[PDB]
Structure 1
Amino acid sequence: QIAEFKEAFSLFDKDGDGTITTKELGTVMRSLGQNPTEAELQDMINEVDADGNGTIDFPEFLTMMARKMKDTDSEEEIREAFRVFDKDGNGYISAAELRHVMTNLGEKLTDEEVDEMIREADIDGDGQVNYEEFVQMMTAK
C-alpha cells in the first residue's frame, strides 16, 4: 500500500518539492498498478482544485484515488484478450504485425512506446512472439 506508493511518488518527484507535474498523473497511476485511459485521467484531472493546479501532492493524489477508486480498480480486471494477426492459428505473430496493431489501430501508440515494450517481451531469433505468453506478461502483476 501507501509505503511503496509513497516511494513511487518520491521517484516521480524529481525536484523534491513534494509535488509532481499534473501531466505525470497518468504515469503515476500506471506506476502504482492501474491501467487508466488518458481520457479517464482527463475526466478526473479536471476539478476546480487540480484543474487549476500545475503540480499535485501525494495527499491530493491519494484523495483522487479514493474518489475514483471503483473506476480505477476496473482497469485491472483484464487478463485475457483476442487479436488475430495469425489466421492459421500458430499462436505466434511477428514484431512487424505487433507494431502495426499497436501504432496504426485503436488508441494509437508511438513507435517509442512499442520499442520500450519490446525490452520486456520475449522475441525469438526468427523475430516472432508467442502472443499467449505476451498477454500473460503484460497482465502479470
Structure 2
Amino acid sequence: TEEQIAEFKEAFSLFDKDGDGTITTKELGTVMRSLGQNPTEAELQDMINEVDADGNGTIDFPEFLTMMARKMKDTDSEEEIREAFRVFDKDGNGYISAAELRHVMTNLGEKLTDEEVDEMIREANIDGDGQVNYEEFVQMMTA
C-alpha cells in the first residue's frame, strides 16, 4: 500500500496546483482545460460535490484517494466485460449475431440449435435489430 499511496499522491499533485493540500473548482478547471475540455463553473461544482465527503467545498487527499479506489474497481470491470464482448464479436463489427454466439457457445461446451440461440438474442435485444451490441451486452452481463 505504501507504494500505492505514493502513486495516488502523484495523481493528486497534478490537480493540486498550489500544493495547499486541496483541490478547488478552479484547479480542477485548469486540468480539464489542459485536457481540451472547458467545463462551466456549474459543471465543475458538480464534479467537486460528488467527491467532497465533508462538504467544506474542496477535495483533500483522503477524499480523492477514496473516490479513486472505488472507481479503479469499476474500470477493471468494464474492461473484463469489454473483453468478453470482443471474443464474442468474431467479426469485430460491433455486433454479436446468432451465428457468432452459437460458434462461441459451442467452444464453451454447449451445442445449441439456431432456435435456442435466437431466444438468447431476443431476450437481450432492445433496439430490435436481432443482434446484441455492447450496450445490450453489458445490461445482459451485469443486469
TM-score bucket (shorter structure): 0.3 to 0.5
* Gap runs ≥5 in structure 2: none
Q: CA RMSD in A?
A: 15.0
1:10, CA displacement in angstroms? 1.2
Query: TM-score scaled by structure 2?
Result: 0.33
- The CA deviation string for residues 5-53 of structure 1, in whole angstroms up to 9 with x for no partner, is 2112112110111111258779999999999999999999656953734
Post-superposition offset of 1:74: 2.8
Q: Percent identity?
A: 99
Aligned residues: 140
Structure 1 window deviating more from structure 2 (109-118 vs 8-17): it is: 109-118
Cα separation, 1, equivalents of 2:110 and 2:46: 17
Change over 3 Å in CA distance of 1:33–1:84 after alignment to 2:
farther
3-state SS of the aligned residue for 1:99?
Answer: helix
Greater helix proportion: 2
Correspondent of 1:42 among 15, 40, 45:
45
Note if contact 1:8-1:32 (Cα within 8 Å) is conserved in structure 2: no
Larger Rg: 2
Q: Distance in 2 between matches of 1:39 and 1:106?
A: 53
Structure 1: distance between partners of 2:63 and 2:12: 12
* More RCO (CA 8 Å, sep 6+): 1
For 2:141 and 2:99, the matched residues in 1 are separated by 18
Is the partner of 1:126 in helix, strand or coil? coil
Q: Which has the higher strand share?
A: 1
Alignment TM-score, normalising by the size of structure 1: 0.33
The one of 55, 65, 70 equivalent to 2:68 is 65
